[PDB]
Amino acid sequence: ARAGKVKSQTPKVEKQEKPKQPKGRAYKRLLYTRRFVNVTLTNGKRKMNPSPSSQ
Amino acid sequence: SDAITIRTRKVISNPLLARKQFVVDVLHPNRANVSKDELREKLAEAYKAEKDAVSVFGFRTQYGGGKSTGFGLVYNSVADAKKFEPAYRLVRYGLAEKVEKASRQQRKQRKNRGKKIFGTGKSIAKKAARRNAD
Amino acid sequence: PKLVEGLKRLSKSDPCVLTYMSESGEHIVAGTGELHLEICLQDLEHDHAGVPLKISPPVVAYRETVESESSQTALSKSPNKHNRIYLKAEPIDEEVSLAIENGIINPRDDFKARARIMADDYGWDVTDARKIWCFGPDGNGPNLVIDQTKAVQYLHEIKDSVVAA
Amino acid sequence: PRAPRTYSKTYSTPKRPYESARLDAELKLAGEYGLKNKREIYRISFQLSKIRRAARDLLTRDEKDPKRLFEGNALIRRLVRIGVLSEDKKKLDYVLALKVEDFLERRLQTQVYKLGLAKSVHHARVLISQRHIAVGKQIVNIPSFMVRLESEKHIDFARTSPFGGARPGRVARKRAAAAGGE
Amino acid sequence: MGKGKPRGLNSARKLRVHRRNNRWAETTYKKRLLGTAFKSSPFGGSSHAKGIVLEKIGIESKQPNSAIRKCVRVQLIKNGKKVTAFVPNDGCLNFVDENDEVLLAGFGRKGKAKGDIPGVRFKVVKVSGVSLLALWKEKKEKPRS
RNA sequence: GGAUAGUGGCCUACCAUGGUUUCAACGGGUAACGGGGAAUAAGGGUUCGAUUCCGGAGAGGGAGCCUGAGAAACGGCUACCACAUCCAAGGAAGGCAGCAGGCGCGCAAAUUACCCAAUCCUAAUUCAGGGAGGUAGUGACAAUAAAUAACGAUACAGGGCCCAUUCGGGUCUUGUAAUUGGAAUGAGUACAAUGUAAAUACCUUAACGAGGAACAACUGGAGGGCAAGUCUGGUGCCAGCAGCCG
Ligand SMILES: *CC[C@@H](C(N)=O)[N+](C)(C)C
Ligand SMILES: [Mg+2]
Ligand SMILES: [Mg+2]
Ligand SMILES: [Mg+2]
Ligand SMILES: [Mg+2]
Ligand SMILES: [Mg+2]
Ligand SMILES: [Mg+2]
Ligand SMILES: [Mg+2]
Ligand SMILES: [Mg+2]
Ligand SMILES: [Mg+2]
Ligand SMILES: [Mg+2]
Ligand SMILES: [Mg+2]
Ligand SMILES: [Mg+2]
Ligand SMILES: [Mg+2]
Ligand SMILES: [Mg+2]
Ligand SMILES: [Mg+2]
Ligand SMILES: [Mg+2]
Ligand SMILES: [Mg+2]
Ligand SMILES: [Mg+2]
Ligand SMILES: [Mg+2]
Ligand SMILES: [Mg+2]
Ligand SMILES: [Mg+2]
């Protein structure tokens, strides 16, 4: 088509039943801990969204 | 248990209004709310006023129950309390009666329908009865 | 704009009137008899629209067809240098078109399953039935394009700009 | 037409949005002192910056002459009562260096945590919002209340509600009825 | 050097007349002082403009990129002027349809072309009282025909 | 001199030829009512001010006037234009830029609600009235304050480690599990009394009111500018995104 072809032509994957990420302060409590408290592993430099280790 | 610990701040005695006007600081230790009929009993015994002459308003408790800060008047007499106080306060207590009257817009419609005519309405009614044949 | 909004303001006045749009891009006003519609179009030009209505009676339509399969023989050339294309035309039976109208056969249907229905039930070569892309014009409607032939390397890019053309 | 009740967009955003180290540094603050928003931080930063702005506009003039001396002192008086500024430092030029971290540690948020009661910080914010905690004999459910240093000692659990021990915690009325049934 | 401009304690006028009459080469100030916004600029110097979709156009874009952009010639209601509005997102001129009231917006650039769409200065927002993004994402549905 | 309450080229007679101007007269424009102020915010500034106060104007236009201390009034009148009502065709009545409402315009803006109890105002006036004014409704214009769980235990992992013949107790502290368990909470309803002109709502509570299915956070973004995907399926110069780069 020549009018929104891609929007139709994709297989719609359905919203998975994944648990509620908490709102307000408890959300901050994650982000505080997922940077400052827990401290992620670093080979050279820090990284906030990792990759599965591959090319 | 609670005891409705009433207090009576800022007693400004007033011969011009024939009353002691004041704030009513009040308490609820474990009770919730004081209520007004219960207050005027407690103001009657305290000031030797009787429920009739006591008139209290405002209040609105602080927060966490705790406290309530009224605005209690105690008149010199019941007849004195009747002729000074605005009518709505006399309705609250059950002293005076609620004034049964027509709606505001109906009063204005009745004002203007009355403004539209001139003189007495007996003249226009007799003319209206004569127009039934016409 | 003053018409359109008035036209909507008429359609709600009278229970009958339907103010739809023709498929050739023309406003239309329905009217139970013909008196009624002269009343509506008197009321619409005043009152509702408040604008002089330039009137005509319809458009309407029409669809062409292809009737007889020529199997022959016109060939392309676009501009120079270029390639070429080719030609033929059918028509496919009205049983097929009816399904494309109805929405039993779709543009967003399974390539293999739709093609097996086409070949068995409706008279087709199953390979050619897979090799159709479009149901023009554009997403829906009973016009088709099919890819026969073998060989030629980079057909897949132009195949889509054939479909689009 | 009584009068326009004035207000302020009090608490005001920084002049870039994505200074990475600020985005972390603000998280650090909202994690340490348990703040639901960036707002809660900027609130303090501005509220503070207003003071700073005075201090600068007083220190421009000679301390010895009047306003400098009076408004400055009153500005200090205000801070020492609110308890941000130390009793070591009452010298106006020290007000200039007050910082956001010192302001937050003075809130009712924190002075719950610093007096025990809660354990684990956030719990206080939850206790405060959940109508326990009375600074005077008066409940406070604003976490960001600013404690008066003088009143710090008076922070206790409320006369009403649990923890003070008037009524235990609203699943007792379930299980006292359930245990009575058995 | 004296540095061009006068420096007298009583100059002022030869500053204040000079800065009136240089400003005029500041394109911000010129549009404000001459009402190009009002006298031109299809929208009447206004955020937006409702305008009836006269036709769904496909506009072949400028170079580097290559795509037909799927736009709409409009007829702005108030002025009676005709403009060309872009229609954002996959298809969605499908959602626009034909002879609809279409609310427009500036594209962003204070007039001017947004990127590669040559001669289109506007985005559709509301088609006959919705919002294209609400249609495109399908959180909201169109009010039938 | 005339007029005006009065000063005056305010008007009239007769006389003189002045008056302003590149220190912008005059003219034009203004999507100009002036000021207070507003936003921005080192300093200097720019832009905005229809809009809660103070002036000024206007009551469809433009005139003219009655009464009156005060009107060139328009919730007074006379007229003409412009617009329109009501008719028994002879003639009548009009002026929301008060409030509410509707059309129209437009990107663009509320209920023909309840009240004088406040605030004040007016009169022959304690006693009447007041869409001035207040009271709600609608209200993501703005602005202020902040819920979207918390504490356990058991069950599987991280951290300190009495000692590291290999273990490991785990004596001490943290994170994960549709485990599970006790303890609250206004979001709501509702006698009451508050509140209130009467009500609502707020603050206060008799009585009920949480267990993941509930009593559910969206918006935008995820190459750079600029915070953060080389995840899984499609897509395949298209369709699209993209302020700019792309
Ligand atoms: C771009 C040149 C041209 C040619 N090779 O002749 N075309 C292939 C026809 C486009
Ligand atoms: Mg309580
Ligand atoms: Mg080229
Ligand atoms: Mg004279
Ligand atoms: Mg003007
Ligand atoms: Mg101005
Ligand atoms: Mg003004
Ligand atoms: Mg204007
Ligand atoms: Mg005024
Ligand atoms: Mg008008
Ligand atoms: Mg007049
Ligand atoms: Mg008037
Ligand atoms: Mg009027
Ligand atoms: Mg009006
Ligand atoms: Mg609005
Ligand atoms: Mg009003
Ligand atoms: Mg509302
Ligand atoms: Mg609540
Ligand atoms: Mg998202
Ligand atoms: Mg993405
Ligand atoms: Mg980055
Ligand atoms: Mg995007």
Side-chain angles (χ1 to χ4, degrees):
Chain A
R2 295 285 145 157
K5 66 166 280 300
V6 76
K7 229 296 183 187
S8 65
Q9 234 153 73
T10 54
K12 186 262 177 174
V13 187
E14 58 266 323
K15 286 266 201 183
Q16 286 182 342
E17 297 177 314
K18 278 283 153 70
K20 58 171 278 183
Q21 284 295 340
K23 273 49 172 175
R25 62 158 16 70
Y27 194 69
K28 296 298 186 72
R29 211 206 276 198
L30 296 172
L31 302 192
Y32 179 50
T33 54
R34 206 190 301 146
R35 260 150 271 198
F36 295 80
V37 186
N38 205 55
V39 187
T40 55
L41 299 169
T42 55
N43 297 7
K45 296 91 184 174
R46 301 194 170 182
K47 207 169 187 179
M48 299 292 187
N49 182 349
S51 50
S53 184
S54 58
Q55 290 160 331
Chain B
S1 51
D2 351 62
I4 314 94
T5 17
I6 193 170
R7 298 281 85 241
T8 58
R9 307 198 95 104
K10 312 194 201 178
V11 174
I12 297 157
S13 306
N14 201 336
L16 306 135
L17 298 176
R19 51 159 93 171
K20 282 186 170 184
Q21 63 172 259
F22 54 90
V23 172
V24 170
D25 192 308
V26 99
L27 287 161
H28 324 105
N30 107 250
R31 185 178 264 102
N33 191 253
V34 281
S35 171
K36 199 185 289 168
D37 290 22
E38 198 164 51
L39 274 147
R40 296 195 303 141
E41 291 165 39
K42 296 210 80 181
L43 267 156
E45 63 108 310
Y47 277 55
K48 202 181 183 181
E50 287 77 44
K51 294 180 225 192
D52 48 36
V54 178
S55 64
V56 208
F57 65 103
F59 284 103
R60 205 200 71 77
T61 55
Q62 281 184 314
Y63 220 80
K67 212 152 175 169
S68 209
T69 57
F71 207 111
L73 318 177
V74 163
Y75 277 85
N76 292 353
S77 192
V78 188
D80 294 17
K82 220 95 179 210
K83 54 142 163 170
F84 281 73
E85 203 78 282
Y88 79 96
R89 299 184 60 175
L90 308 175
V91 172
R92 285 161 126 176
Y93 313 139
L95 282 143
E97 40 61 53
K98 210 282 186 180
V99 185
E100 286 83 30
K101 283 286 182 182
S103 293
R104 176 166 197 74
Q105 279 281 72
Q106 292 173 12
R107 289 152 148 173
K108 293 169 177 174
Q109 261 76 291
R110 182 174 267 94
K111 190 205 295 187
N112 291 35
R113 283 184 293 181
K115 195 208 288 80
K116 284 167 182 183
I117 64 168
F118 180 83
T120 327
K122 295 173 187 176
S123 58
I124 204 169
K126 290 170 181 176
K127 294 157 195 170
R130 201 77 211 173
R131 292 157 188 176
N132 293 348
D134 296 30
Chain C
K2 280 76 175 180
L3 167 56
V4 167
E5 192 152 49
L7 235 169
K8 290 284 197 167
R9 205 58 136 272
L10 181 75
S11 63
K12 61 177 77 175
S13 183
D14 286 49
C16 74
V17 59
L18 85 76
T19 59
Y20 99 103
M21 298 306 300
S22 176
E23 208 65 20
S24 187
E26 262 277 75
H27 276 290
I28 301 292
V29 187
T32 41
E34 51 237 333
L35 160 56
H36 164 97
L37 196 52
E38 290 186 320
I39 296 300
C40 290
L41 293 196
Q42 200 72 4
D43 295 331
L44 176 57
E45 70 184 302
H46 306 331
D47 280 25
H48 299 282
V51 177
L53 283 190
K54 177 68 273 222
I55 298 157
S56 217
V59 166
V60 274
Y62 301 68
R63 305 290 184 271
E64 304 173 46
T65 206
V66 294
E67 190 56 37
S68 68
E69 60 115 302
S70 68
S71 202
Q72 72 198 336
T73 11
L75 273 195
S76 303
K77 271 188 192 219
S78 201
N80 287 341
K81 174 247 283 218
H82 297 271
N83 64 34
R84 307 172 66 91
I85 328 148
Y86 299 114
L87 292 154
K88 188 215 179 141
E90 256 178 327
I92 196 56
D93 287 25
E94 295 163 46
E95 220 180 332
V96 172
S97 64
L98 262 163
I100 295 159
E101 295 151 41
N102 270 30
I104 305 165
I105 300 169
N106 294 326
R108 303 274 156 263
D109 218 316
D110 294 292
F111 276 84
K112 297 168 186 173
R114 166 182 97 243
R116 283 202 107 72
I117 295 157
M118 286 269 277
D120 294 29
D121 246 55
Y122 296 120
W124 272 112
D125 182 29
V126 71
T127 53
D128 290 328
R130 295 140 157 283
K131 285 155 134 187
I132 71 100
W133 307 284
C134 44
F135 299 76
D138 172 8
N140 252 307
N143 302 62
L144 302 167
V145 134
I146 322 204
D147 207 73
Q148 300 174 257
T149 76
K150 224 79 262 292
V152 330
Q153 296 172 31
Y154 305 74
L155 204 45
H156 187 279
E157 294 189 317
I158 74 171
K159 271 169 164 204
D160 207 70
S161 293
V162 147
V163 164
Chain D
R2 286 188 296 188
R5 293 260 274 210
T6 34
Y7 37 102
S8 178
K9 198 201 83 197
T10 40
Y11 304 127
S12 69
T13 190
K15 306 201 177 179
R16 319 209 211 96
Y18 301 132
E19 203 288 309
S20 58
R22 187 191 297 125
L23 299 179
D24 289 308
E26 283 188 65
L27 219 195
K28 192 172 195 180
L29 280 256
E32 279 185 59
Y33 315 104
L35 310 177
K36 203 228 285 83
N37 291 306
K38 304 277 78 149
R39 185 180 292 106
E40 296 199 64
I41 302 154
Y42 304 147
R43 163 168 321 109
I44 229 68
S45 89
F46 171 92
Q47 187 255 304
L48 181 236
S49 177
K50 275 280 181 178
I51 293 148
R52 169 168 297 92
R53 193 191 294 183
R56 293 152 70 262
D57 200 44
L58 299 176
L59 289 163
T60 189
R61 297 159 207 165
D62 169 38
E63 278 71 20
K64 261 171 183 190
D65 268 41
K67 293 168 208 177
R68 330 84 215 266
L69 202 148
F70 315 153
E71 293 184 53
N73 187 58
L75 171 147
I76 295 154
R77 278 189 73 266
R78 186 178 283 92
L79 295 169
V80 297
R81 284 207 325 102
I82 226 167
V84 176
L85 232 197
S86 76
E87 297 81 49
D88 308 50
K89 298 165 188 172
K90 305 186 184 177
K91 206 110 174 192
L92 209 277
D93 219 68
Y94 285 127
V95 174
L96 269 177
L98 269 190
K99 215 162 188 181
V100 303
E101 293 165 19
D102 301 10
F103 262 101
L104 291 158
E105 292 167 311
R106 205 56 259 179
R107 289 152 72 129
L108 191 265
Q109 286 198 162
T110 53
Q111 288 297 336
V112 165
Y113 180 62
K114 288 191 165 190
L115 304 178
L117 281 73
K119 311 172 187 173
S120 197
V121 187
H122 307 281
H123 180 211
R125 231 99 323 131
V126 176
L127 292 166
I128 294 154
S129 65
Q130 295 171 351
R131 214 75 101 72
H132 318 280
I133 290 70
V135 174
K137 275 78 183 196
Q138 162 201 118
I139 298 175
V140 173
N141 53 302
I142 280 88
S144 332
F145 154 93
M146 299 301 294
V147 190
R148 229 110 267 81
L149 189 272
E150 304 316 306
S151 67
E152 168 264 296
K153 189 60 170 172
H154 296 244
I155 299 159
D156 286 311
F157 282 104
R159 282 181 170 178
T160 63
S161 94
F163 303 95
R167 287 170 155 194
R170 252 75 172 184
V171 176
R173 302 200 194 284
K174 191 273 302 194
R175 216 222 190 165
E182 295 178 39
Chain E
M1 273 291 303
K3 272 291 136 188
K5 67 198 190 287
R7 312 196 54 128
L9 191 261
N10 300 345
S11 50
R13 230 180 305 89
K14 187 145 270 191
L15 301 164
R16 220 217 315 94
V17 74
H18 196 241
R19 287 327 224 65
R20 277 201 286 88
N21 298 317
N22 274 177
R23 263 251 205 71
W24 279 101
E26 203 176 33
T27 56
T28 67
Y29 179 83
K30 202 189 289 150
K31 294 202 297 184
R32 200 202 293 108
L33 269 283
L34 296 185
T36 50
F38 288 97
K39 295 180 179 168
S40 318
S41 81
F43 294 18
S46 170
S47 59
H48 295 301
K50 272 176 187 205
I52 269 59
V53 171
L54 269 175
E55 56 217 298
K56 288 153 64 174
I57 298 170
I59 293 184
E60 290 104 45
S61 56
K62 298 208 205 78
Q63 225 292 255
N65 72 53
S66 43
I68 307 96
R69 275 282 104 102
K70 284 84 236 198
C71 336
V72 159
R73 163 147 268 99
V74 159
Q75 183 187 96
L76 300 189
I77 289 176
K78 55 171 155 184
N79 305 300
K81 293 205 211 180
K82 292 151 200 169
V83 302
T84 333
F86 183 67
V87 187
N89 307 322
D90 286 317
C92 301
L93 80 164
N94 300 126
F95 283 100
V96 172
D97 306 283
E98 223 299 295
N99 194 187
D100 304 63
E101 168 268 289
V102 110
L103 185 270
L104 298 176
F107 223 135
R109 294 282 235 82
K110 310 163 206 182
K112 316 205 165 194
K114 188 269 188 77
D116 71 321
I117 314 162
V120 170
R121 302 160 66 192
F122 313 106
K123 306 158 70 62
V124 170
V125 181
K126 309 189 69 169
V127 194
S128 73
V130 262
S131 42
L132 280 181
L133 198 139
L135 305 187
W136 168 53
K137 296 235 165 191
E138 306 181 290
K139 299 158 190 164
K140 193 162 281 177
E141 308 182 319
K142 188 193 290 176
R144 64 180 169 185
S145 56

